[PDB]
Design a protein around this nucleic acid. Structure first.
Lengths: 64, 831, 804, 206, 60, 42
RNA sequence: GGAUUUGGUGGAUUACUAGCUAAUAGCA
């Protein structure tokens, strides 16, 4: 919090975070992991201290 | 912010933070005062052994340090402190908010420069006083007069003149009269360093662009000029050993020596201090010696000497290059990991982001040393594969220590960032080991652990595989696979029967190391981050990603205690040596002490810098912590180790805003008497009764070859209560007890003896201290047995005895109880 | 389990230094070599601090407040210790042979006689947290030209008397302004000045010299100056005045002379109150109680200490340390007392709690080698190199029998049958094992078959079989009892040094020269386990050695071993600086202990300082005693063990139990929850919950909170798993508790409820049962013995007729 | 979950037949019979019919006469081999005994698919005389378990031997038959007949 | 020779009973002279046996 | 003595009007000599 | 570029309260 200075929440990802993208106004956060996976946090600004990604996306070739 | 269990002690490993050090002389020797953050340290030039440390930390970071004979003067913010032997003697507080910048002292005058180009003069109250305290006057230099103050310098033989040096030029001020006596001509280049020469009337000036000017002040004219193109001067110093030698320090980290008489460069020392940390912050010749001290912002102090010339003649021409004499140093960046080397508190193991591993000794600074990274020659005989340019090993993420097998082979494992094998170290050799341990699964090393016997090394890979080797030979023995994610902790009990593992996948694996079988698997809600295993109690705590510490007992494999309260990720945590307390550090800049028996946080602290590591001493006396800032080690004293600590839970809301007593102290006192009917002995040593009964035979062997008591007795007799007499009877020494009993009146009507029987009869009713009461009345028969027997028929004597027998008859159950317990005890043990 | 800590040192009560009486006068502080031993006379309790110097202790003092203790060794290294906490605050070096240290009676300052320099220093405050530099200097004083013999404070904490080897005593002022008051140098003696003291009024200064002269000085007109008004002289034929102390309140002088005799005088009359002799050895130190009633004297050569009540001419305290390494040791069956034997040829019995020698036996002419108790405990047997085995009854303290070989053989090892009917000894010269009948004393037979000397011996407590070992690289099991005699030899890799035998009698452990602890099944006569121990052993390079400790083979083996009474651990010791405790069925090292850290002893350090060499050789050589453990033993009644060594009998105990070792705990279990159960009267749960947490303080609270009516109900329902802990708890609590009846009722319920379970598993419970038996023997019986005698004494005075 | 103690294939410069590696997996009598499933059905014969220590071959050169009860710890197969050799001509020849016993287990497995070691144990347990007689006339008396196992081995060996003393049937087959019948409990085995007669005679003198 | 015998003593090769003796002034009694022998891991003991070709490294 | 020090692997001690205080008492102080005599002796 | 041997010095091998001295104080 810029005004108060307290940690509202700590978002935890499965693998190391490389890139971060935010949608709207805290609506959703997409973070690129180092392992090659993408994690989406849904309404991260609404236990409460530590939250985990809700949706996880991967890419795999047909071969494997 | 104040702990009820812990208190800061001192900082280890920091010799200098970059502020120019001050040199002072006491007699023949010389001592150097070096800044360490908010504190200063004094080293002996003979040995670089610390001599004193500042008694308390200054409120603000120290900016300027000056020392003159015993006294050391320290300037911080708008206050100048005076210290003797590290003890503050007086504080000089300035009347302006402007912070002090430079400090100069000569004779009776103390001169302080503030950032606002204001010079304050203090003078001594008395000529024979030891330091100046009084405020003489204020002198301020305006922009028209000159530029910003570079330094305050006083040259010899100048009767209360201060040679003020500015970026624009030099100015002379008479402190006594407070007038500008002379203004130096403007110089094209900004002045950076000023140093009075050993000659009269010349001061050496250093500029921004590699120019050294021996400006003669008396003539107000330049004498000489040395050119150092593409360099910035940082320090100057003349040699006073009889050789006209000048040292010029540079921010590049390069120290050059010139021969003024010969106008030639004697030698250059390259890269003595890091350019990134300011190069050579300060370099000073020792007065009257061929030796020079050097320091820098790289947390290092070095010591160089000029050897005698090897030529019998023309020695001035044949000058030996200066040679490294000695030094002290530490990590150039904040330490990343710390460890306790031994069961004692003697030696520490520290690693930092400067790719360094150091051994630091709390007991004495001189004992601190850096382990070498010279690689042993491989056993096979082939060439080692590595870059020809020698480079320092990558940062140590993790480290494990054992001393069961110190001196026989490698006793250490370390893990490196972005790197697929583990390197060994030998504390006794203080050198890298001859064994390198690979994950064998294409994964980075994440966990390193030791068996207590020191014969097995355990490596945790990022891919979830565990490899077990032998340290003496460095050969793989067993390799386990449960975790599919990175394993963040491996622990083996003091036995080596059962090993526990934890990984980011959130499972905890319980294995039988001896039989190599999966004893059990436990899944936790959140991913695991770290493990600490307490071998003595066989309890281990896990740092979960949900901001909790979960304690598990390996014997039953159940979660036993869970700790909540941390508002951010837990950076580190440790078990107390007695396994009763856990102290953890988290990114919320707080240190919390948790009492496992009650499972609550008992003490909380707020650290200005997040504590990266926390480690207890095996003795438990000290707690060592590392912070995100600072190259040293913060050492704390365990106050619990000297006095009891209340175990009441700490106030969460109060802690957040800043950012049954016997139970509370973990103690209990036995009741004086559990029940009135119950027979209870005296509160004292059990040898007293033997002493009272057999005093005379004890007393015989020992040879070489109205009273208060009577007053209380009669007072009790009228009161019909002898408690006051009874209480004092317990308190007398055995010798005193005998005398009072013997001194008792033995003549008719025998009033005294009757009441004593009554007094003892009352005590026997109490059922407390009864064994004493049997002892005194035994002494009564010994001392008055003839008397009582002679007049047994007297009603008063007979009635008193009969009453006691009524009470004493009741106290026969003890005979039945004691005499029974032996029958069963003899039997159960026998048959 | 394996949480042992040094507690006290028996067998040595005084070595050197100055003994100091406590502020209350009820405790005596005696330096014992490298450590300090404190003795509580009134309470009959003793303790030795865990902190250790690197050398023997030279000077010591305790402040009048009783909070701070300062001890200095022979290198000037001073250790400041919190007396109440028994913990060390800071360690300091004066860089000189500090002769004496003494606190100011105010306690703000303390002064040390350091050579010719008197150093006055400011006492740190005990309450303040430890700092890097606690001490603060006040002044350094040098008027004397030679080293200072002793110093004295004024009762007002203002003026000092210093006596030095300059044949002069010198007075100083603590306050600079008061320098003019006292800046006098006192002269006129012939020999060294041992002491200088103030009178109670402080107007008279008394000075004593080595030759035996006492000078009384007074400030008087010949204008006023100090003068020797009176001169008294000690009339010893050859004894020199060596140490002197004065009590201003009672005007008492105690002077100890080199001849071994001291005299008590009354000043200024010089009235010889008394004169007594400690022997032919110097009486190393003398001290006075704050009352002035008790005088403490100590002799270094024989390690004597005596506390003498001159008022009653009675002896408060009197012991001596063994002037030897204690060759052997043995515990009583109850463990209340321990007997030690030395090379002097004399056997002492020591009480563990008081730390004091109750009895000694000097019949043996030569060194006593081994000592053992019978199963009953009434009897003790000892063997000596003089060639006899001597049997002792403690009840009458008589040598009731002596056994001797026909061939005049020296005996080194001994064992007594559990029945106490056969006594069997071994020799290093005979290669055979001798046997005798205790009842008649005849030599039954000489057991032969060993081709090497028998090194050590032991009988089975259960099977009654005998196990013998030798340097013949073999173990022989002898079935002496029975119609037929059979011998079972078993070979071992290397020479055997020690045997320990399991309490069950079904295995035997052996220590070999190779450094291996091998265990064998006696009935099956095959190896069942082995432990490697050579590397665990810590052995120090000797100053005389020319070969590294690592390459040394001087002692990489254990000369003594013993099992734990439970049978799960072995304690091992040898001619080395390590005591190692292993776990038998498992074969690991549970913990290792460093015997000593005194560099005065030769073998303590593995690596010796290169400075001490010169081209000539080691400066130290310009022989020293060796660190070694002669014997070790476990406490039958307590979780403790004793190790015999050169300095004395080190006793390691688990009594403090500050460690948190919970068992089967859970989240619901909490000290508050335990109290909640008690207030709810769920006594059984509260007792169970407390034992899970395993705190001594809670268990007392639950234990004493159970009403007598509910005890049998609780006892019957206690789980078997917590039966050992409660049994151990009651015994430890009972022995010093006051609730004799409460404890007994508990024992009555527990034994009746679970008597069968005790019998099924004797050895898991044996130590606890002995502790209980110790209570019902050593205190409970005596009370009723005192109770019953008075009952009979009463019956006479009423029944019988008194007349004429 | 899996544990790997072997990260390379093992090939020895000297060749080894693979059945030897299969033996490395488990110790089996003659590398052909497992001890794991063998149990003594009767409780009394336990602690004196010793089968828990596996051995490749009956030969051990153990010290089994030193003490009284040492013979208990002996493997029972070795006891049978020792009892087999007798009558002077076979004295000193333990190797022939081992060969004969190996043939006997081969025959037993052929005739009954059950593990022959269990057949041996069953025969020994069945044939142990539980009660006997002593001369005073005769009086019934109980029998100690070591006497049972010793006497059982004696009857089995003696019956098998005498049956093949002057007959075409060889020692191995007569053994296999006698142990098989004793394990069955059929009266055909000589030892069972003797045990029955002994116990009955003691019953008469009870 | 005695001097050869002396040199080996300070070099830590000789053991009387189970203890090495570095002092060349120790007297040995008629009983104890039986057991004046070498330290087990002495290089010389290897030299003695390596000569006669009876070295067994298991003992060492 | 002198032969013991020369023959001893370990250190060997040196072996050792007015009333003298018996430094050593062979028995506890508290026991009486009469209590140390058996009835047969009496 | 790799390997073998070796000389010298530095820090420890004892627990960190300033130097020098002719030392109640002077010197530096």
């Amino acid at each position: 919090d810029i005004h108060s200075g307290m940690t509202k929440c700590v978002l935890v990802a499965e693998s190391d975070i490389k890139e971060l993208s935010h949608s709207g106004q805290a609506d959703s956060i997409a973070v690129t992991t180092e392992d090659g996976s993408l994690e989406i946090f849904v309404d991260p600004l609404v236990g409460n201290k530590s939250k985990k990604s809700s949706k996880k996306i991967q890419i795999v070739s047909k071969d494997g | 912010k104040n702990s009820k269990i812990f208190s800061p002690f001192r900082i280890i490993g920091n010799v200098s933070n970059g502020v120019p050090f001050a040199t002072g002389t006491l007699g023949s020797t010389f001592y150097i005062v070096t800044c360490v953050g908010k504190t200063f340290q004094i080293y002996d030039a003979n040995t670089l052994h610390l001599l004193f440390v500042s008694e308390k930390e200054t409120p603000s970071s120290i900016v300027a340090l000056s020392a003159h004979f015993h006294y050391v003067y320290a300037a911080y913010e708008n206050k100048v402190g005076i210290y003797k032997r590290g003890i503050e003697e007086h504080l000089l507080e300035l009347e302006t908010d402007a912070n002090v910048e430079h400090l100069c002292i000569f004779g009776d005058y103390l001169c302080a420069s503030t950032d606002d180009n204001s010079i304050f003069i203090y003078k001594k109250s008395d000529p024979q006083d030891k330091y100046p305290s009084e405020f003489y006057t204020k002198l301020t230099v305006t922009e028209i007069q000159g530029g910003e103050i570079v330094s305050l310098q006083h040259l010899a033989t100048y009767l209360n003149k201060l040679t003020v040096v500015t970026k624009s030029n030099v100015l002379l001020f008479n402190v006594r009269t407070g007038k500008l006596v002379f203004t130096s001509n403007e110089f094209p280049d900004q002045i950076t360093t000023a140093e009075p020469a050993p000659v009269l009337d010349i001061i050496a000036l250093g500029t921004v662009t590699g120019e050294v000017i021996m400006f003669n002040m008396r003539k107000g004219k330049r004498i000489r000029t040395i050119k150092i193109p593409q360099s910035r001067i940082s320090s100057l110093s003349f040699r006073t050993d009889g050789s006209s030698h000048l040292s010029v320090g540079t921010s590049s980290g390069d120290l050059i020596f010139y021969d003024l008489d010969r106008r030639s460069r004697i030698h250059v020392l390259k890269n003595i201090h890091r350019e990134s940390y300011g190069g050579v912050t300060q370099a000073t010749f020792l007065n009257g010696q061929p030796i020079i001290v050097t320091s820098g912002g790289d947390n290092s102090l070095k010591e160089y000497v000029f050897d005698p010339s090897l030529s019998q003649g023309s020695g001035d021409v044949v000058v030996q290059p200066p040679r490294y004499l000695r030094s002290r140093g530490g990590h150039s960046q904040p330490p990343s990991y710390i460890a306790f080397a031994d069961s004692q508190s003697h030696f520490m193991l520290s690693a930092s982001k400067d790719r360094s591993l150091w051994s630091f000794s709390l007991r004495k600074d001189a004992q601190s040393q850096e382990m070498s990274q010279r690689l042993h020659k491989k056993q096979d005989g082939g060439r080692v594969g590595g870059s020809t340019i020698k480079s320092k090993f990558p940062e140590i993420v993790a480290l494990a220590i054992e001393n069961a097998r110190i001196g026989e082979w490698e006793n250490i494992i370390t893990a490196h960032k972005d790197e697929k094998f583990a390197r060994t170290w030998d504390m006794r050799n203080k050198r890298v080991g001859r064994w390198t341990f690979d994950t064998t699964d294409d994964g980075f090393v994440k966990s390193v652990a030791m068996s207590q016997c020191g014969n097995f090394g355990f490596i945790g890979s990022s891919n979830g595989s565990i490899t077990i080797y032998n340290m003496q030979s460095g050969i793989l023995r067993k390799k386990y696979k449960l975790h599919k994610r990175a394993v963040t902790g491996i622990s083996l009990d003091g036995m080596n029967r059962k090993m526990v593992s934890c990984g980011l996948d959130g499972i905890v694996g319980f294995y039988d190391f001896n039989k190599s079988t999966l004893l059990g698997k436990l899944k936790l809600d959140a991913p695991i981050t770290a493990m600490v295993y307490h071998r003595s109690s066989d309890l281990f705590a896990l740092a979960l990603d949900d901001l909790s510490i979960v304690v598990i007992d390996a014997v039953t494999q159940r979660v036993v205690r869970q700790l909540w309260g941390h508002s951010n990720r837990i950076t580190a945590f440790d078990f107390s040596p007695e396994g009763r307390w856990i102290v953890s550090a988290s990114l919320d800049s707080t240190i919390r002490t948790w009492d496992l028996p009650t499972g609550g946080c008992i003490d909380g602290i707020i650290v200005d810098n997040v504590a990266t590591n926390v480690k207890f001493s095996p003795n438990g006396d000290l707690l060592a912590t590392t912070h995100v800032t600072g190259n040293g080690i913060c050492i704390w004293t365990n106050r619990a180790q000297f006095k009891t600590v209340s175990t009441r839970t700490i106030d969460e809301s109060e802690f957040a805003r800043m950012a049954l007593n016997d139970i509370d102290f973990n103690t209990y006192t036995s009741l004086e008497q559990i029940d009135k009917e119950l027979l209870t002995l005296s509160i004292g040593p059990r040898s007293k009764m033997n002493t009272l009964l057999h005093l005379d035979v004890i007393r015989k062997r020992s040879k070489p070859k109205e009273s208060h008591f009577t007053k209380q007795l009669r007072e009790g007799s009228q009161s019909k209560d002898y408690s006051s007499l009874l209480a004092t009877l317990i308190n007398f020494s055995p010798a005193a007890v005998d005398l009072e009993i013997r001194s008792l009146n033995s003549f008719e009507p025998f009033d005294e003896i009757v009441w004593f029987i009554d007094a003892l009869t009352q005590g026997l009713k109490s059922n407390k201290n009864f064994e004493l009461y049997e002892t005194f009345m035994s002494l009564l028969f010994k001392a008055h047995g003839d008397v009582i027997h002679a007049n047994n028929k007297n009603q008063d004597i007979a009635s008193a005895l009969q009453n006691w027998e009524d009470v004493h008859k009741k106290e026969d159950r003890l005979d039945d109880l004691v005499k029974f317990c032996m029958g069963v005890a003899a039997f159960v043990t026998t048959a | 389990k394996s949480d042992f800590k040094f507690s006290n040192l028996l067998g040595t009560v005084y070595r050197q230094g100055n003994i100091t009486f406590s502020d209350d006068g009820k405790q005596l502080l005696s330096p014992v070599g490298n450590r300090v031993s404190v003795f509580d006379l009134i309470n009959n309790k003793s303790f030795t601090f865990e902190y250790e110097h690197r050398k023997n202790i030279a000077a010591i003092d305790l402040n009048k407040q009783g909070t701070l203790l300062i001890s200095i060794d022979e290198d000037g290294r001073a250790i400041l210790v919190n007396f109440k906490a028994r913990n060390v605050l800071h360690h300091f070096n004066f860089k000189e042979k500090c002769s004496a240290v003494k606190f100011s009676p105010d306690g703000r300052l303390f002064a040390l006689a350091s050579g010719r320099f008197l150093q006055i220093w400011k006492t740190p405050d005990v309450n303040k947290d430890r700092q890097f530099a606690p001490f603060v200097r006040h002044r350094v004083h040098a008027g004397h030209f030679q080293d200072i013999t002793s110093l004295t404070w004024s009762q007002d904490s203002r003026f000092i008397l210093t006596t030095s080897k300059d044949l002069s005593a010198k007075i100083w002022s603590v306050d600079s302004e008061e320098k003019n008051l006292a800046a006098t140098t006192f002269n006129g003696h012939r020999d060294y000045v041992m002491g200088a003291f103030f009178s109670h009024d402080q107007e008279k200064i008394y000075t004593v010299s080595k030759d035996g002269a006492v000078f009384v000085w007074e400030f008087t007109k010949r204008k006023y100056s100090w003068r020797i008004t009176k001169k008294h002289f000690f009339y010893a034929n050859q004894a020199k005045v060596k140490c002197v102390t004065f009590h201003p309140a009672t005007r008492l002088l105690a002077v100890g002379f080199t001849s071994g005799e001291f005299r008590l005088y009354d000043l200024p009359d010089f009235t010889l109150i008394q004169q007594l002799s400690m022997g032919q050895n110097p009486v190393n130190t003398v001290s006075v109680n704050q009352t002035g009633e008790w005088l403490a004297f100590g002799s270094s050569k024989l390690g004597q200490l005596l506390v003498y009540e001159w008022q009653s001419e009675s002896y408060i305290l009197k012991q001596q340390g063994h002037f030897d390494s204690t060759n052997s040791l043995a515990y009583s069956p109850d463990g209340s007392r321990v007997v030690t034997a030395s090379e002097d040829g004399k056997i002492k019995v020591w009480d563990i709690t008081s730390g004091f020698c109750l009895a000694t036996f000097e019949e043996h002419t030569s060194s006593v080698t081994a000592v053992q108790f019978a199963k009953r405990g009434q009897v003790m047997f000892s063997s000596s190199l003089d060639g006899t085995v001597r049997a002792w009854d403690l009840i009458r303290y008589r040598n009731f029998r002596t056994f001797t070989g026909t061939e005049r053989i020296q005996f080194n090892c001994l064992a007594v049958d559990p029945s106490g009917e056969v006594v069997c000894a071994g020799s290093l010269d005979n290669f055979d094992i001798h046997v005798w009948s205790v009842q008649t004393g005849q030599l039954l037979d000489a057991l032969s078959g060993h081709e090497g000397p028998v090194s050590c011996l032991s009988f089975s407590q259960e099977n009654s079989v005998l196990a013998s070992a030798s340097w013949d690289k073999t173990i022989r099991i002898w079935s002496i009892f029975g119609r037929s005699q059979q011998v079972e030899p078993i070979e071992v890799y290397s020479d055997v040094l020690a045997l320990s035998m399991r309490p069950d009698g079904k295995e035997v452990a052996v220590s070999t020269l190779k450094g291996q602890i091998s265990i064998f099944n006696i009935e099956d006569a095959k190896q069942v386990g082995n432990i490697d121990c050579r590397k665990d052993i810590i052995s120090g390079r000797f100053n005389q050695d020319r070969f590294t400790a690592k390459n040394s083979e001087r002692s990489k083996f254990f000369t003594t071993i013993h099992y734990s009474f439970d049978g799960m651990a072995i304690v091992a010791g040898g001619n080395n600086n390590s005591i190692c405790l292993y776990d038998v069925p498992n074969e690991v090292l549970l913990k290792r202990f460093i015997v000593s850290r005194n560099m005065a002893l030769n073998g303590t350090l593995e690596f010796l300082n290169s400075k001490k060499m010169t081209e000539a050789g080691s400066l130290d050589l310009i022989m020293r005693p060796e660190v070694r453990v002669t014997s070790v033993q476990f406490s039958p009644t307590a979780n403790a063990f004793a190790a015999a060594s050169t300095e004395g009998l080190l006793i390691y105990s688990t009594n403090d139990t500050i460690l948190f070792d919970p068992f089967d705990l859970d989240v619901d279990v909490t000290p508050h929850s335990t109290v909640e159960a008690l207030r709810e009267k769920q006594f059984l749960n509260a007792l169970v919950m407390a034992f899970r947490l395993n705190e001594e303080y809670l268990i007392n609270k639950v234990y004493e909170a159970i009403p007598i009516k509910e005890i049998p109900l609780v006892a019957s329902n206690i789980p078997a798993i917590y039966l050992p802990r409660i049994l151990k708890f009651i015994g430890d609590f009972a022995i010093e508790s006051q609730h004799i009846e409460f404890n007994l009722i508990w024992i009555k319920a527990l034994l009746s409820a679970s008597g069968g379970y005790i019998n099924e598993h004797k050895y898991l419970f044996s130590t606890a049962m002995r502790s209980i038996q110790r209570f019902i023997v050593r205190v409970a019986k005596e009370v009723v013995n005192t109770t019953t005698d008075n009952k009979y004494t009463y019956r006479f005075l009423v029944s019988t007729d008194g007349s004429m | 979950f899996e544990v790997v103690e072997e990260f390379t294939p093992v090939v020895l410069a000297t060749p080894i037949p693979e059945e030897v590696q299969q033996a490395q997996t488990e110790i089996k009598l003659f590398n052909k019979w497992s001890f794991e499933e063998v149990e003594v059905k009767d409780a009394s014969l336990v602690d004196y019919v010793q089968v828990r220590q596996p051995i490749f071959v009956a030969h051990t050169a153990g010290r089994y006469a030193n003490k009284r009860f040492r013979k208990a710890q002996c493997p029972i197969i070795e006891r049978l081999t020792n009892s087999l050799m007798m009558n002077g001509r076979n004295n000193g020849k333990k190797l022939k005994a081992v060969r004969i016993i190996k043939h006997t287990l081969d025959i037993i497995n052929v005739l009954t698919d059950q593990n022959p070691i269990q057949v041996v144990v069953d025969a020994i347990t069945n044939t142990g005389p539980r009660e006997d007689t002593t001369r005073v006339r005769r009086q019934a008396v109980d029998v100690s378990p070591l006497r049972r196992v010793n006497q059982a081995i004696a009857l089995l060996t003696i019956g098998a031997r005498e049956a093949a003393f002057r007959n075409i049937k060889t020692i191995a087959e007569t053994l296999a038959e006698e142990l098989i019948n004793a394990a069955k409990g059929s009266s055909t085995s000589y030892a069972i007949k003797k045990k029955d007669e002994l116990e009955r005679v003691a019953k008469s003198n009870r | 020779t005695i001097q050869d015998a002396v040199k080996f003593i300070e070099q830590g090769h000789v053991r009387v009973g189970p203890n090495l003796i570095n002092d060349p002034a120790y007297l040995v009694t008629r009983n104890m002279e039986d057991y004046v022998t070498w330290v087990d891991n002495s290089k010389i003991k290897k030299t003695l046996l390596r000569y006669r070709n009876q070295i067994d490294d298991f003992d060492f | 003595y002198k032969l013991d020090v020369l023959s001893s692997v370990h250190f060997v001690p040196k072996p050792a009007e007015t009333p003298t205080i018996s430094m050593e008492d062979a028995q506890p102080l508290y026991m009486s000599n009469a209590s140390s005599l058996a009835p047969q002796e009496i």
